[PDB]
Structures are given as C-alpha cells and as structure tokens.
Amino acid sequence: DIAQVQVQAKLQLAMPLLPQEVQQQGVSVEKSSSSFLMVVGVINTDGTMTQEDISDYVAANMKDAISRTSGVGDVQLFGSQYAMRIWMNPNELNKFQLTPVDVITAIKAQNAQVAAGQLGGTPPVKGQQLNASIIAQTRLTSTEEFGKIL
Amino acid sequence: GADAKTVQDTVTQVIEQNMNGIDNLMYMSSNSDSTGTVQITLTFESGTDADIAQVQVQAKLQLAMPLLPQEVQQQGVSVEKSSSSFLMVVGVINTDGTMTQEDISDYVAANMKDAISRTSGVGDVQLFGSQYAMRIWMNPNELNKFQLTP
Amino acid sequence: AVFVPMAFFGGSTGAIYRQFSITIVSAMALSVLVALILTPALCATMLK
Amino acid sequence: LKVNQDGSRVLLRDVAKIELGGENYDIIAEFNGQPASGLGIKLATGANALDTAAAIRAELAKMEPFFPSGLKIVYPYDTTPFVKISIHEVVKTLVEAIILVFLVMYLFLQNFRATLIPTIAVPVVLLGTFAVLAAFGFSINTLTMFGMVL
Amino acid sequence: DTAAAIRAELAKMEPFFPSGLKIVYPYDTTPFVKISIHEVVKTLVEAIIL
Amino acid sequence: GMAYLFVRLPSSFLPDEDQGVFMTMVQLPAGATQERTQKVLNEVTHYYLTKEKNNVESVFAVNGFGFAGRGQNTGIAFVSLKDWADRPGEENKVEAITMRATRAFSQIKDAMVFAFNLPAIVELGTATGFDFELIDQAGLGHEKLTQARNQLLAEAAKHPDMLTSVRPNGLEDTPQFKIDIDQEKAQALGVSINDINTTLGAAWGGSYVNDFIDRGRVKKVYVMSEAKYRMLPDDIGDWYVRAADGQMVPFSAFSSSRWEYGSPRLERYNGLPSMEILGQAAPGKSTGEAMELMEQLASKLPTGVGYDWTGMSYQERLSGNQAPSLYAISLIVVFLCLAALYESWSIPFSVMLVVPLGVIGALLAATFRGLTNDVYFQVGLLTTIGLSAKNAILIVEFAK
Amino acid sequence: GAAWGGSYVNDFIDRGRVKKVYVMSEAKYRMLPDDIGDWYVRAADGQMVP
Numbered sequence: 002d003i004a005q006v007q008v009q010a011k012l013q014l015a016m017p018l019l020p021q022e023v024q025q026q027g028v029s030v031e032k033s034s035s036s037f038l039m040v041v042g043v044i045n046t047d048g049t050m051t052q053e054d055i056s057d058y059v060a061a062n063m064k065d066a067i068s069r070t071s072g073v074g075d076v077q078l079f080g081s082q083y084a085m086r087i088w089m090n091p092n093e094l095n096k097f098q099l100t101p102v103d104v105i106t107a108i109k110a111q112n113a114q115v116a117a118g119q120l121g122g123t124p125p126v127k128g129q130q131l132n133a134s135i136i137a138q139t140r141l142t143s144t145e146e147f148g149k150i151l
Numbered sequence: 152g153a154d155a156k157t158v159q160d161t162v163t164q165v166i167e168q169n170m171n172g173i174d175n176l177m178y179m180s181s182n183s184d185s186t187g188t189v190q191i192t193l194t195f196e197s198g199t200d201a202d203i204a205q206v207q208v209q210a211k212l213q214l215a216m217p218l219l220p221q222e223v224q225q226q227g228v229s230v231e232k233s234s235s236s237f238l239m240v241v242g243v244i245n246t247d248g249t250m251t252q253e254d255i256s257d258y259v260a261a262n263m264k265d266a267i268s269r270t271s272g273v274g275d276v277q278l279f280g281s282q283y284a285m286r287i288w289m290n291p292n293e294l295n296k297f298q299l300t301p
Numbered sequence: 302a303v304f305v306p307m308a309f310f311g312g313s314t315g316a317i318y319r320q321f322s323i324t325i326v327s328a329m330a331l332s333v334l335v336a337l338i339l340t341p342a343l344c345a346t347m348l349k
Numbered sequence: 350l351k352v353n354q355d356g357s358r359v360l361l362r363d364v365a366k367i368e369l370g371g372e373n374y375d376i377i378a379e380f381n382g383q384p385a386s387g388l389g390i391k392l393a394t395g396a397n398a399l400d401t402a403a404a405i406r407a408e409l410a411k412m413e414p415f416f417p418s419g420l421k422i423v424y425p426y427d428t429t430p431f432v433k434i435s436i437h438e439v440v441k442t443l444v445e446a447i448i449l450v451f452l453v454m455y456l457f458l459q460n461f462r463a464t465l466i467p468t469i470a471v472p473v474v475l476l477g478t479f480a481v482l483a484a485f486g487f488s489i490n491t492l493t494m495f496g497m498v499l
Numbered sequence: 500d501t502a503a504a505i506r507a508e509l510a511k512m513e514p515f516f517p518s519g520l521k522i523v524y525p526y527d528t529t530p531f532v533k534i535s536i537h538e539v540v541k542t543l544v545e546a547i548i549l
Numbered sequence: 550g551m552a553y554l555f556v557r558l559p560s561s562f563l564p565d566e567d568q569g570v571f572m573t574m575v576q577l578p579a580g581a582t583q584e585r586t587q588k589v590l591n592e593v594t595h596y597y598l599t600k601e602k603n604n605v606e607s608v609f610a611v612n613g614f615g616f617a618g619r620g621q622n623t624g625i626a627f628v629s630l631k632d633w634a635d636r637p638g639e640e641n642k643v644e645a646i647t648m649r650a651t652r653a654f655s656q657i658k659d660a661m662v663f664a665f666n667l668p669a670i671v672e673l674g675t676a677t678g679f680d681f682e683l684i685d686q687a688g689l690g691h692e693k694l695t696q697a698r699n700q701l702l703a704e705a706a707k708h709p710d711m712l713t714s715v716r717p718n719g720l721e722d723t724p725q726f727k728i729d730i731d732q733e734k735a736q737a738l739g740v741s742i743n744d745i746n747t748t749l750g751a752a753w754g755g756s757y758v759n760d761f762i763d764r765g766r767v768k769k770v771y772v773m774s775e776a777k778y779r780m781l782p783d784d785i786g787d788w789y790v791r792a793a794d795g796q797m798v799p800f801s802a803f804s805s806s807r808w809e810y811g812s813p814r815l816e817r818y819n820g821l822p823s824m825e826i827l828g829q830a831a832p833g834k835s836t837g838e839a840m841e842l843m844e845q846l847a848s849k850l851p852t853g854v855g856y857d858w859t860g861m862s863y864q865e866r867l868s869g870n871q872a873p874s875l876y877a878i879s880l881i882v883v884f885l886c887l888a889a890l891y892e893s894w895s896i897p898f899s900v901m902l903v904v905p906l907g908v909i910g911a912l913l914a915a916t917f918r919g920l921t922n923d924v925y926f927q928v929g930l931l932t933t934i935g936l937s938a939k940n941a942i943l944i945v946e947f948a949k
Numbered sequence: 950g951a952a953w954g955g956s957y958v959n960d961f962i963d964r965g966r967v968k969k970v971y972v973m974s975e976a977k978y979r980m981l982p983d984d985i986g987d988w989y990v991r992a993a994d995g996q997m998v999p
C-alpha cells in the first residue's frame with residue numbers, strides 16, 4: 002500500500018520534464034504480479050460481429066467495473082476500445098493543398114466543448130426573473146458528423 | 152461557466168474511467184451541476200483506513216489530470232475527507248464600524264480560514280461568501296467604441 | 302455468554318452493538334474481580 | 350490596452366468598471382436579517398469530534414485581538430454543549446443511582462457500616478472500565494457512558 | 500475471493516448483452532482451489548476412518 | 550403473548566433526539582433567481598423570530614446553497630435554539646416546532662420549505678425507508694432515462710397496496726439557451742473560432758486570467774461584464790468580435806438563438822449515468838417488503854435499464870438478519886457455560902427459560918408507551934437476561 | 950509523427966461514453982520506404998514541397 006504511494010509521488014515530480022504526447026497518454030502506477038488468474042473470453046455465435054466490435058463492448062461496459070471490483074492490480078484489454086479513427090489520404094491532401102497539421106487544427110476547434118456562462122449571471126441585476134445555462138459548441142457523436150468538418 | 156452537459160464528459164467522465172485499481176471500494180457516485188461543479192464520492196468498506204484511502208484516490212485522478220480543460224487545472228481540484236454534516240459554525244457579523252456582506256467574507260478568508268482548515272485535522276472548510284479578487288466588469292459598448300474584444 | 306457473542310457486530314452498526322457489550326463486559330469481569338477480591342476482604346475486616 | 354491614431358490613450362478603466370468585490374456572488378449569508386459571512390467546518394471522517402472543536406477556538410482565540418472596529422464573533426449551530434450535557438446528565442445519573450442504592454441498603458440493613466461495602470464496590474468497577482476502554486481504542490461516547498448507567 | 504467478485508460484477512452485466520454475445524472461461528485458477536480442498540478434506544476423512 | 554408483543558412492536562434504529570439545533574432547507578421551481586429565493590428566506594426568518602421568540606435564539610440564513618447541491622434556487626437556515634432550561638414543555642421542543650412549520654407552509658406560499666430534526670444517527674438509518682437508484686446499462690441517453698424514471702415513479706404510486714411513498718431526488722429539468730455557431734459563416738467574414746469562444750466564455754461565465762497581491766496576501770483576478778449586458782437573450786448581439794480585416798462584427802451575424810430542454814444536474818453511478826429515487830416504506834410495510842416489491846417494478850421497464858441500490862443502505866441490517874444470528878450463539882454459549890460449573894443435563898434448562906420471564910415485562914413497557922424496538926431497547930433485553938440469569942442461578946446454586 | 954506513428958488529437962463522445970480520436974493514414978501509404986515522398990508539406994509561399 003505505502004510502496005505504491007512513494008513511487009507515484011516521485012514520478013510526478015519528473016512528469017513536467019516529459020513530452021506533451023506522453024502526458025495525455027496513460028501513465029499508471031499499479032500493483033504487479035506477473036501471472037493471470039481469471040481470463041474471461043468474449044465471443045459471438047448468433048448475431049455475428051468482428052474482433053473489434055467485441056473488444057469495444059468489453060472496454061465500455063465490463064472492463065471499467067472489473068478493475069474497480071475486489072482490488073484488481075491491473076487489467077489488460079485483449080483488443081482495443083473504439084475511437085474515431087481517421088485515415089489521411091496523402092494524394093487527396095496535395096490535390097487541395099493541405100497537410101496533417103491542418104487536419105489536426107480542424108478537429109481541435111469544431112470538435113470541442115466550450116464553457117459558456119449563463120443568462121442571469123452569478124452577480125445579476127436585482128429583479129431578474131429567469132436563470133438558465135448557455136450551451137455553445139458540442140462534442141461530435143458519429144462517423145457522419147466527423148465527415149462534415151470544414 | 153460550464154453548464155451541466157459540459158462538465159459531465161470533460162471533467163466527470165475523464166476521472167471515472169481512471170478511478171480504477173484501488174484497494175477496497177463498494178461503489179462510486181457523482182453530481183455534475185449547471186453552475187459548473189462536479190463532485191465524486193468513493194465510499195469504502197467499514198473499518199477501512201481513511202488515511203490510505205485518500206492517497207489512492209488522489210493518485211489516480213492525477214493520472215487523468217492532463218486530459219482535462221486548462222480552465223479546470225488552474226481551478227481548485229481537491230480530495231478531502233467528507234462527513235455530510237457540520238458541527239462548529241462560526242458566524243461573523245458587524246455592529247460598530249459597519250461593512251457589507253463581502254468585506255466580511257474577505258477578512259474571514261484572509262486571516263482565519265487558512266488557519267482553521269489546517270488546525271486539528273479538519274476535513275474541508277466551506278467559506279460562506281467569497282474571498283476578495285480584482286473584479287473587472289467589461290462594458291461591451293465601450294469596447295466597440297475603441298474597437299476591441301475580451 | 303450473551304453480551305460478547307452479541308458483540309459480533311456487522312456493518313454501520315459496528316460500534317453500536319459492539320460498544321454496548323464489551324464496555325459493560327469489562328464492567329462485568331471487573332465486578333467479578335471486585336467480588337472475588339476486596340469485597341471478601343472488607344467483609345471480614347469490618348462489618349459487625 | 351490601445352493608443353488610437355491621434356495619440357489618445359485607451360485604459361482599462363475607460364472601457365470597464367473596476368471594483369474590488371467577491372470572486373463568487375452565487376451565495377451571500379445573513380444572521381437574523383443582518384449581512385454576514387462565516388465558517389462551516391465539517392468533520393474529517395475519523396477526526397476527534399470535540400477535541401477538534403476545542404482547537405477551532407484555539408486558533409480563533411489568537412485571531413480575536415487583531416480585529417477591525419465592530420467585528421465580533423457569534424455562535425449558531427454548535428454541537429459542543431450537547432457533549433457537555435450528556436456527560437453532566439449521565440454523571441448526575443451515576444451519583445443518583447449510588448445514593449438511592451444507599452437508602453435500600455439501610456432499610457434492609459440498619460447498620461451504617463454495613464451500607465458501605467457496596468457503596469465502595471461499584472465506584473472501583475466504574476473507574477476500571479475507563480482503563481479497559483483506553484487500552485482497546487474506545488472513547489467516552491454516548492454509548493460507553495449510557496453503558497456505565499446500564 | 501477476488502476471482503469470486505469478478506463473477507459478481509460480471510453477473511449484473513450479463514442481462515444487457517446484445518444478440519449472440521456469450522461468455523466463455525479459458526485459463527482459470529478457481530477450480531484448482533476447489534479440488535485442493537476437496538482432496539485434502541477427503542484425505543482427512545480417510546485418515547480418521549483407517 | 551411474548552411473540553405477539555414482539556412482532557407487532559415496530560422497529561427503529563435510534564431515537565431522533567432534541568439537539569437544541571435544527572435546520573430548514575428551501576427549493577424553488579425551474580429557473581428561479583437569487584432575488585426570488587431571497588423573498589422565501591425572509592419569510593422563513595420571520596416565523597422563527599417574531600412568531601417564535603421563546604424557542605429560537607438566532608437564525609443563520611444562507612441564500613443559494615441547499616444540501617441537495619448548489620444553485621440560486623436552493624437555500625438553508627441553520628437554526629440555533631435557546632438553552633434547554635428556557636424551553637420547558639413538549640411544545641417548545643424540536644418535534645413540535647417543526648411540525649407546525651411543514652403543513653402550515655406547505656399548502657400556502659409557492660415554493661417548498663420543510664424543516665426537520667437533525668438525525669443523531671448518520672445519513673443512513675431512517676428505518677422503514679429505502680434508497681433506490683435506476684441505471685442506464687446500455688447505449689440510451691439521458692432523455693430516454695428520464696422516460697424510464699417517470700414510469701418507475703408512476704407504477705409505484707399507481708397501485709399502493711400497503712403503500713410506498715416515492716419521489717425523485719432532484720432532476721426537476723429546466724430549459725437551457727443553446728447558441729449554434731455556424732463555422733462557414735464565421736471564417737467567411739474572417740473571425741477566428743478561438744476569439745469567439747473566449748468572448749462568450751470570459752463575459753457570461755467568467756475567466757481566470759491571472760494572480761495579483763492585495764494587502765500582503767495573494768488572490769485571484771477575474772473578468773466578465775457589467776450586470777445589465779448579460780441578463781437577457783437579446784443582449785448577445787451587443788458584443789462585437791473583431792475580424793482580421795480590422796472591422797467589427799456582431800454576434801447575431803454568425804449565431805443562431807434557440808431554446809432547448811436539458812437538465813441542471815446529471816447524476817452518474819459507477820461509471821454510468823443514473824437517476825436517484827428517494828422512496829420509503831408504508832406505515833404497514835417495513836424495509837424488506839418495500840424493497841422486493843420495488844425490484845419487480847424495476848424489471849418491468851424497457852431494455853437497457855437495470856438497477857443498483859444506491860446508496861447508504863446497507864450491509865446486513867439490525868432488526869432482522871443480524872439479530873437472529875447474534876441471539877443464536879448467545880444460546881449456544883449460555884448452555885455450555887452453565888455446565889462448566891454444574892455438571893448435569895437439567896440445571897441449565899432452568900436458566901434457559903427465565904429468558905421469556907423477564908422479556909415479557911420489557912415488551913410491555915415499550916409497547917404501552919410511545920417507545921419502539923431500537924438499539925437502546927435491544928441491549929436492555931440482553932441486560933435483563935443477565936439479571937434473570939443471576940437471580941435464577943442463585944436459586945439453582947444454593948439449592949444444589 | 951501524425952501519419953506513420955499516429956497522434957492523440959482530441960476527445961469525443963460515442964453512445965454516452967467518452968473515447969479518443971486518432972489520426973494517421975490509409976494502410977497502403979505507409980508500408981514501404983519509397984512512400985515517404987508521397988507526403989507533401991506546405992511552405993510559407995503557398996506551394997507544395999515533397
């Protein structure tokens with residue numbers, strides 16, 4: 002218990018001296034025991050799906066609940082959780098004169114949630130009748146909406 | 152400034168996937184308000200050490216801290232020991248040299264509040280007002296006059 | 302045989318049915334120590 | 350902020366009001382219809398309830414002398430005197446149960462020295478119980494004082 | 500006891516599965532514990548009867 | 550008569566005491582303001598001051614903070630009653646004070662204010678009362694979880710039934726002002742999307758800019774706007790963002806104003822969204838029956854909707870499950886210890902039926918008055934088994 | 950970096966939960982060493998450069 006605390010309270014001192022790519026990625030200080038015990042396979046028989054549809058449902062329903070339950074050390078997902086995957090064609094960038102930098106900027110602008118204030122603010126005028134929260138930009142949902150990014 | 156939906160997936164959900172691999176734990180709950188204030192509650196087993204339980208919860212949130220907005224980072228994230236109920240409530244009023252309900256709340260949070268939370272193992276202090284701050288009220292008509300923005 | 306076995310608490314009523322036994326169980330065994338020692342002593346020393 | 354064509358200076362005061370006010374106007378408390386702030390201290394999930402409330406006054410006592418004109422402390426919502434009444438009413442019950450045991454031991458045994466062995470029997474057993482609670486971890490609670498009565 | 504609570508959380512997940520989704524169990528240490536208790540307590544009763 | 554006076558005798562956990570200090574929370578309807586709820590907190594302060602001078606010493610109101618959570622709808626007033634000596638009768642004690650606060654205010658007025666004694670207890674342990682919660686275990690959203698929650702609350706009070714009192718925790722549901730910023734209209738005139746997001750963000754909601762120093766200490770610096778320029782939906786066009794070609798552009802150009810329906814509090818239990826239900830048992834039923842007759846209503850709802858009992862309650866209760874097992878080993882150890890100093894198969898049975906001799910008297914005093922089977926009574930039983938064992942062992946020891 | 954190896958851009962929401970968003974390239978344009986010249990980075994003077 003105490004051995005895990007001191008190791009992750011020292012790594013954290015040297016966290017700022019790492020690349021910004023590694024910071025947003027998953028750093029983890031867990032308790033290890035080189036050996037599995039309960040391996041729970043997940044297959045399909047009737048309504049057939051791929052080895053990708055299954056790994057998403059395992060990591061979006063039962064994986065978050067398993068690692069939390071009865072003191073599990075660390076869980077290893079056998080596949081990958083779903084993610085809005087984009088495959089940049091290099092020939093179709095040169096056609097319209099563009100780079101991967103312009104694609105990344107388009108997603109970090111349109112695909113984002115902004116913190117707008119609220120009508121009838123925290124310090125209001127005496128005698129205001131209503132008070133609601135403002136919504137502005139919303140994070141995208143499906144494959145169709147990601148295809149319509151200008 | 153963020154509304155209920157904004158804080159529900161930019162702060163709340165980020166921590167909840169990274170709230171795993173902890174010793175003990177029965178369940179987790181959460182409340183994401185429209186004012187812009189999330190609060191989680193990991194209730195552990197009876198007779199568990201509250202000292203070590205606080206360490207593991209704040210050494211896992213910290214892994215998912217970089218995946219949050221930069222507004223929330225500079226704001227006050229806090230992992231304290233909770234007990235839904237007050238005991239000593241110390242009111243602060245004025246009689247002679249009269250002041251407002253704003254001048255008083257500053258002096259409470261700039262003299263005696265920092266000393267109270269530190270003393271004899273206090274869980275968490277709730278200031279009844281707000282500490283002073285250089286407040287600026289941008290007039291929109293006087294920005295357009297000189298051609299400017301926030 | 303009724304205080305201490307009832308003091309095998311469970312859950313939020315941990316120190317509720319526990320403390321309302323063991324506290325008085327120490328009072329029972331110290332009254333047995335005060336009835337085997339000292340009460341015999343002062344009865345013989347001075348009574349009539 | 351800016352310097353318009355003709356050498357005129359635009360300042361932050363010219364475009365916006367500047368008042369030194371609160372950081373958060375979402376809450377403002379009163380005390381019998383009088384402008385006020387306060388300190389809502391909550392327990393630390395294992396703290397020493399009353400000893401923590403006694404050291405709330407300890408830190409507060411060194412703050413008192415350096416107060417502005419009119420600033421006075423008041424005490425609404427306080428659990429301190431309920432502890433002081435439960436000890437004053439159980440120890441009153443303790444002394445009442447000894448004095449009424451004396452009257453029953455005098456009616457049956459008219460000898461004054463006979464009504465004396467049981468009078469100096471139970472006081473010894475009550476003190477011994479305090480020694481066992483200190484050696485096991487228990488405290489002077491509402492339960493281990495009503496237990497002295499039973 | 501950790502492997503028993505792996506089924507506890509998994510049991511509440513079962514009812515809300517899509518069509519065809521079924522759970523299987525390869526590589527499991529659970530029944531080796533149940534055989535070591537069933538073979539030592541069998542040895543216990545055999546040593547008393549002899 | 551001993552079995553009849555035990556089952557009919559109801560079950561509490563711990564009596565709610567006079568603490569000399571209670572409170573009363575406020576809750577206003579959809580989209581109320583700070584000025585509206587302040588009128589309600591003033592009327593509450595009058596009842597305790599002018600209409601209750603003898604019982605109350607001081608009130609400590611707090612506008613915009615209930616124990617539900619936060620917002621300018623809620624409120625709370627920490628009452629601090631006079632000492633016990635100046636409050637003599639039962640009328641001047643907490644129970645009677647908060648009784649003529651509820652059914653009085655409720656019915657009249659417009660908002661909802663209660664008043665209630667402080668549970669000595671903890672957050673849990675009301676007795677004859679549960680805490681349910683409904684989970685979204687599939688891919689349906691919050692809008693579809695609202696419909697399933699309304700169907701659980703409906704069918705519960707549709708057939709009572711040895712009743713079941715049930716209300717939601719606080720998902721009232723109020724409207725929100727959405728602003729759709731068209732991305733093609735913005736870039737055409739030449740405004741950056743970065744500039745537009747921190748115009749709306751650092752004006753209406755506020756923005757943490759930097760730190761400064763005031764009188765030795767170090768505090769914060771915020772930026773927003775004068776009150777009048779951010780109250781109504783028509784004041785959005787008053788802001789003008791600058792474009793790359795050195796000229797002003799109004800918000801109304803690229804924006805689109807339109808109302809919606811969201812929720813001001815999205816609860817989530819265990820990595821999944823949820824909706825808390827604070828229900829209760831009937832005057833007839835009690836806990837165990839109310840919970841199992843809420844589970845077959847929880848499984849009668851559409852797909853992708855399950856349940857999980859959230860969330861203070863419990864882990865094996867006290868009047869029930871626990872008590873049986875505790876008294877069971879109390880008989881097995883009493884029997885063995887009455888034999889270590891006796892040697893028979895008859896002497897110990899004499900002491901094993903003075904249990905009901907003294908117990909019938911304890912059940913008679915509690916059921917006659919307004920008391921109930923709680924913690925203080927259940928330990929008063931085991932003490933009377935030790936006092937009935939004592940007297941009877943003297944009748945068995947000297948006689949043998 | 951954001952073509953051959955991949956790059957963590959932003960977060961989005963899929964069916965209630967919150968997942969990740971990645972950016973790379975179709976499989977065929979990053980298998981061989983001769984496919985490096987297929988990418989063209991833009992210069993300050995508005996024209997492509999291999």
Ligand SMILES: N=C(N)NCCC[C@H](NC(=O)[C@@H](N)Cc1ccccc1)C(=O)Nc1ccc2ccccc2c1
Pocket residue numbers: 484485486487
């Ligand atoms: N289960 C309970 N209630 N207590 C376990 C205590 C463990 C051990 N003392 C013991 O192990 C003995 N109580 C056990 C025992 C010894 C001899 C005869 C019977 C039982 C002991 O360490 N006692 C205590 C007591 C209070 C403490 C308070 C704070 C910090 C440490 C403490 C340690």
Ligand SMILES: N=C(N)NCCC[C@H](NC(=O)[C@@H](N)Cc1ccccc1)C(=O)Nc1ccc2ccccc2c1
Pocket residue numbers: 663714715716717718719827828829
């Ligand atoms: N978060 C909210 N709003 N309520 C939680 C309160 C818990 C519980 N009482 C109830 O749950 C009752 N509201 C149930 C009920 C009883 C009678 C008619 C309708 C509903 C309770 O413990 N105390 C009471 C007693 C009676 C009440 C009647 C109306 C409103 C609140 C009440 C609270």
